[PDB]
Symmetry: D2
Subunit: 253 residues, 4 copies
């Protein structure tokens, strides 16, 4: 079992993967503080989850926004036990063609938003007695994914920040691990023409693209005390994408 009688703040929780993550966690008996910069939906989402949700606005790149939400969650539910740095943005383009400003923007949200997320929540956690900080990274943060430039650098930096942090916080019973989903089906990626459904994606050994229910079960698992001895680790959720080239690619075509 991966149950939860605690409170957790999930970022980028209005739509996408954060929405699912939150859906399952509340299902898991936890109370959730969704946080996004897209109100309309965060409002609805929490409005769907029920009495165990509460949506807050949160511009992940701002420590003020950050401290505000932390307090509010300590204030409302009485504790901050888990975090889910899930907010960020994609970069699909040939590095030579990327602008130094967009670059500065993806890293900012992807990389710093995460750090500002962690050092803020650490005190509320030393308070609880411990915490679980699941940073949602990517398959791209595990191998050199071409065409992800700024997205690539950031996601690899989230991977290292979660490790050093894991080392420093250990004695505090504060775990820090990264999750790395691969090509997962959602409306952002939907605009990428990703053939959803079994066997519809041939460049992953599993032959198919993952769905969010899949990546979310991983987060929750770590959020729980099931994994009371897991810290500074990386869990890829990509149907083998990252393990090695599939057969066809190895055969030479």
């Amino acid at each position: 079992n991966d149950l939860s009688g605690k409170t957790v703040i999930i970022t980028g929780g209005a739509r996408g993967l954060g929405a699912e993550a939150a859906r399952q966690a509340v299902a898991a008996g936890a109370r959730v503080v969704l946080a996004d910069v897209l109100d309309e939906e965060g409002a609805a989402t929490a409005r769907e989850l029920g009495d165990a949700a509460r949506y807050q606005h949160l511009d992940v790149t701002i420590e003020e926004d950050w401290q505000r939400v932390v307090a509010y969650a300590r204030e409302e539910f009485g504790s901050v036990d888990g975090l889910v740095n899930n907010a960020g943005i994609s970069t699909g383009m040939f590095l030579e063609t990327e602008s130094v400003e967009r670059f500065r923007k993806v890293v900012e949200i992807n990389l710093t938003g995460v750090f500002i997320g962690m050092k803020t929540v650490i005190p509320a956690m030393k308070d609880a007695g411990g915490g679980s900080i699941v940073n949602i990274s990517s398959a791209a943060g595990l191998m050199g994914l071409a065409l992800t430039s700024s997205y690539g650098a950031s996601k690899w930096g989230v991977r290292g920040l979660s490790k050093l942090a894991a080392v420093e916080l250990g004695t505090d019973r504060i775990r820090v691990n990264s999750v790395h989903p691969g090509m997962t089906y959602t409306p952002m990626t939907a605009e990428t023409g990703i053939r959803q459904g079994e066997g519809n994606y041939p460049n992953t050994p599993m032959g198919r693209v993952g769905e969010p229910g899949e990546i979310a079960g991983a987060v929750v698992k770590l959020l729980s005390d099931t994994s009371s001895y897991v810290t500074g680790a990386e869990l890829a959720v990509d149907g083998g994408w990252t393990t090695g080239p599939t057969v066809k690619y190895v055969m030479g075509q």
Copy 2:
């Protein structure tokens, strides 16, 4: 949470981490076959797990043995959906010190013996339509652990066999992943001088050693369908021993 309402053979399951994943998974709703070389212990252990547990003598390096336990599982139970490869033997000495004969024996039980398990059981899983192989590797398989010689090489072989098999079985619904515990508290390790408790093992970030219950949960999670997209992955359950040096170390002792 994770539900394993299916069939699983556990290698080395009569004591320690094996028996632990035995009892825990049964609780999870699975039907377990304790395959092990200790008849007396495996008998007692299975005896106490109810009509959900069976004991069958198994020498991991004997292929005849394998085809029996696999056939009995499928006959007696109806099929085989998961295999937890937990059997092996440790090494604690400087490489130049190890006899080539010891070296081969260990690498035989640890690496070759999991190969038979995978090569054998595969046809039982393609049948049922899929399943999960969970190879119990080690912290000695994620970084170079000194003094482990044959066990180091052994376990790294498992991290690798695990991966290649996943890229191969990907599209047959057969899932394979490695599980890498760090200093866990087992009889084999109690002898060593290891002691459980907060602050009892400085040289690992969480300051202590894990118990088997914390490792099994990583296991049940992979066996369960909840991880239906985690293939060719490697999860460490070592309180950060493996993630990077300890603070004290990064500076100086």
Copy 3:
């Protein structure tokens, strides 16, 4: 041996290992372009290395400072074949301590800084028939290193960027790799209490720290044509520091 009778610009070139890499690249016939921000000391050095080198002021974070340095070399030796992105600043503090402002500051100098160099110098290398990008990183980008926060974070970022740039640039004859030097005895490091010599640094299997000359050789080897088939690679140059814990640590002291 490793020959490089070609031209390369060296970022952070005025001092320490950026100065040693230049001292070496020149010895091997390189037309070296030292580019730092210490105009006064960078002129002393390029002066010292003779008529094989020039000095340019390069603020790594400014897109034009970058285009001018390239344009200077370009219209100076013929082309741009190699590039060593060595400029950066360190971080010695727990994450909870680093301000989000210092965080942005360091990351801007370490990550983006090297990115601006990659896309700026690229067209120069295309018109040169290809070449090699050598991104200096460190043990901090190879494992979770405590007390580095932003430096650990950007260093992992320069690792993941090298690789993605590698797969994208392969066909135009551009090789991208990251060197990963461990505790080396440079200017900034002598102030810590770091003593050079054998026996002096017990927490690395070699029991010593590295003089910059040993780190330089990797730069050059990767800059020469002797490594024509090396791309997306990562070479640790730390005396074993990131391979695994010291035997003493493994046994608990």
Copy 4:
């Protein structure tokens, strides 16, 4: 730099990688000792390098063979400085397909073989006051390579034996590093239908198969004092095979 004045025993030196590294090593002043099971071809190859080469018939799985050649090296030459474990056979068949006899056989040459090699030479090197052991692994040791069954499980095992040894021996001045070749143009790989040349392998970022002079050079560099601080490392000479998938593969196509 890349100039030897030391004596090095290369294994599998009758033909291929061993043959190339032999030339170059000798070309950099190394007195080399070729070891092979091909008594006819190596004696030929040796006659080529001159009076700085020497052939011996060695069976890697025979410790007695090992103790003999190592004795001979220190007899004709007086010391043993390097070792290049290049012996080992391949595999290219699915897991379930391969026998338990062949597996135990490829493992024993590829893995146990390097083990005796390492265990027999270490003393000859302490006597010498230092040495460099280069174990030749493979891109199959770096990722889960499909159809490489037993060959994978040993290549991954050599990578791990290299690291734990590097640490056990560091303060002794003996470096252990693994090299990782990707699709390299040798006879059988050519007899695999591998069309040599630029652009002839679309499934590797560099778009081609490597040449042996290209893997030889990296072995040469790691064998010298030009990497005195390189221990516990792993270098990959694979044209980007390992960094990550082809742009084409990321787009799918």
